[PDB]
């Protein structure tokens, strides 16, 4: 019986762990792990953390700042160019994801770090990772908002951002399964809101059209429309069955209302 990491201190926050994460044994044995909020170095003792805070020069994530809108910034970090950082980030994320798979061999991934910026620097709020090439068309590998930031719109921002990447690449995608319970709700909310706003405005459109407009897969569009009861089935084909008033009725609900923070595509500066 060797103790696991059960508590971290990061920035001004203390956060209890939700799941096993494979930090080295000597690190799990300690009462609390201490993480630099910028370089994500993990440390055993308050004294080595205090020393690091006074020495570390990083005040943002590494990689490229590919989105900036007011005090929200997203940083793109290649797992091959910044392997230790990405390894730390994965260890941190495994404390709050049950089924996240890889931690150490991060070269196949790009990581998108969501930050909230103030005078002291750019503070990590959440992330998603993404396979550089995905056979099964997963535009998200793992995705996480850190607990003290959850249920405030940051998770839907991440989801939206991942689809804006997909729209840029002219592809559709879907997050890797399994999702967390919070993950399923956040995706169902985002999918529903995106589709309802399109159907509210819009010439008529097919399932394949909505897929082309949103980068949401047809299967994810279909299952969203079924849960909203806005699709008919006619001899093996799903057909959109939109009553223009029930669309409005759905948009006044809390589960499918607009997310408070939205990705302004103009502020996204990206390319292959
Ligand atoms: Cl907590
Ligand atoms: Cl959210
Ligand atoms: Na933070
Ligand atoms: Na989007
Ligand atoms: Zn540091």
UniProtKB/Swiss-Prot annotation:
Residue ranges occupied by any MYST-type HAT domain in the UniProt entry: 3-272
Subcellular location(s) of the protein: Nucleus; Chromosome; Mitochondrion
Effect upon mutating residue 7 to N: In LIGOWS; uncertain significance; no effect on protein expression; no effect on MSL complex assembly; decreased histone acetyltransferase activity
Resulting phenotype, residue 94 to M: Does not affect non-enzymatic 'autoacetylation'
Zinc finger boundaries on the chain: C2HC MYST-type: 33-58
Activity control note: The acetyltransferase activity is inhibited by anacardic acid derivatives.
Molecular functions per Gene Ontology: enzyme binding; histone H4 acetyltransferase activity; histone H4K16 acetyltransferase activity; histone H4K5 acetyltransferase activity; histone H4K8 acetyltransferase activity; promoter-specific chromatin binding; protein propionyltransferase activity; protein-lysine-acetyltransferase activity
GO cellular component: chromosome; histone acetyltransferase complex; kinetochore; mitochondrion; MLL1 complex; MSL complex; NSL complex; NuA4 histone acetyltransferase complex
GO biological process: dosage compensation by inactivation of X chromosome; myeloid cell differentiation; negative regulation of DNA-templated transcription; negative regulation of epithelial to mesenchymal transition; negative regulation of type I interferon production; neurogenesis; oogenesis; positive regulation of DNA-templated transcription
Enzyme class: transferase
Predominant place of localization: nucleus
Catalytic site positions: 176
Record PTM N6-acetyllysine, positions in chain: 100
Processing after translation: Acetylation at Lys-100 facilitates cognate substrate Lys-binding and acetylation. Although considered as an autoacetylation event, acetylation at Lys-100 probably takes place via a non-enzymatic process following acetyl-CoA-binding, which primes KAT8 for cognate protein-lysine acetylation. Deacetylated by SIRT1.
Subunit structure, interactors included: Component of a multisubunit histone acetyltransferase complex (MSL) at least composed of the MOF/KAT8, MSL1/hampin, MSL2L1 and MSL3L1. Component of the NSL complex at least composed of MOF/KAT8, KANSL1, KANSL2, KANSL3, MCRS1, PHF20, OGT1/OGT, WDR5 and HCFC1. Component of some MLL1/MLL complex, at least composed of the core components KMT2A/MLL1, ASH2L, HCFC1, WDR5 and RBBP5, as well as the facultative components BACC1, CHD8, E2F6, HSP70, INO80C, KANSL1, LAS1L, MAX, MCRS1, MGA, MOF/KAT8, PELP1, PHF20, PRP31, RING2, RUVB1/TIP49A, RUVB2/TIP49B, SENP3, TAF1, TAF4, TAF6, TAF7, TAF9 and TEX10.
Record disease entry: Li-Ghorbani-Weisz-Hubshman syndrome: An autosomal dominant disorder characterized by global developmental delay, mild to moderate intellectual disability, speech and language impairment, and variable facial dysmorphism. Some patients have seizures and autistic features. Brain imaging abnormalities are observed in some patients and include decreased white matter volume, enlarged ventricles, thin corpus callosum, and gray matter nodular heterotopia.
Official protein name in the record: Histone acetyltransferase KAT8
Naturally occurring in which organism (per UniProt): Homo sapiens
Range covered out of full length: 177 to 447 of 458
């Amino acid at each position: 019986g060797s103790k696991y990491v059960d508590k971290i201190h990061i920035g001004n926050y203390e956060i209890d762990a939700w799941y096993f994460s494979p930090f080295p044994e000597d690190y799990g044995k300690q009462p609390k792990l201490w993480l630099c909020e910028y370089c994500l170095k993990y440390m055993k003792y308050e004294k080595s953390y205090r020393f690091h805070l006074g020495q570390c020069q990083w005040r943002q994530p590494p990689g490229k700042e590919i989105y900036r809108k007011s005090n929200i910034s997203v940083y793109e970090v290649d797992g091959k160019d910044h392997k230790i950082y990405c390894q730390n980030l994965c260890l941190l994320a495994k404390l709050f994801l049950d089924h996240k798979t890889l931690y150490f061999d991060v070269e196949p991934f790009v990581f998108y770090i969501l930050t909230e910026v103030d005078r002291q620097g750019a503070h990590i709020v959440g992330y998603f990772s993404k396979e550089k090439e995905s056979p099964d068309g997963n535009n998200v590998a793992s995705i996480l908002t850190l607990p003290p930031y959850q249920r405030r719109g940051y998770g839907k921002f991440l989801i939206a951002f991942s689809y804006e990447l997909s729209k840029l690449e002219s592809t559709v995608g879907s997050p890797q399964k399994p999702l967390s319970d919070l993950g399923k709700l956040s995706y169902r909310s985002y999918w529903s809101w995106v589709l309802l706003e399109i159907l509210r405005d819009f010439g008529t459109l097919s399932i394949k059209d909505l897929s082309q407009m949103t980068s949401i897969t047809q299967n994810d569009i279909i299952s969203t429309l079924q849960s909203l009861n806005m699709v008919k089935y006619w001899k093996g084909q799903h057909v959109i069955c939109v009553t223009p008033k029930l669309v409005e009725e759905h948009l006044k609900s809390a589960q499918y209302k607009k997310p408070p923070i939205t990705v302004d595509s103009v502020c996204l500066k990206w390319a292959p």
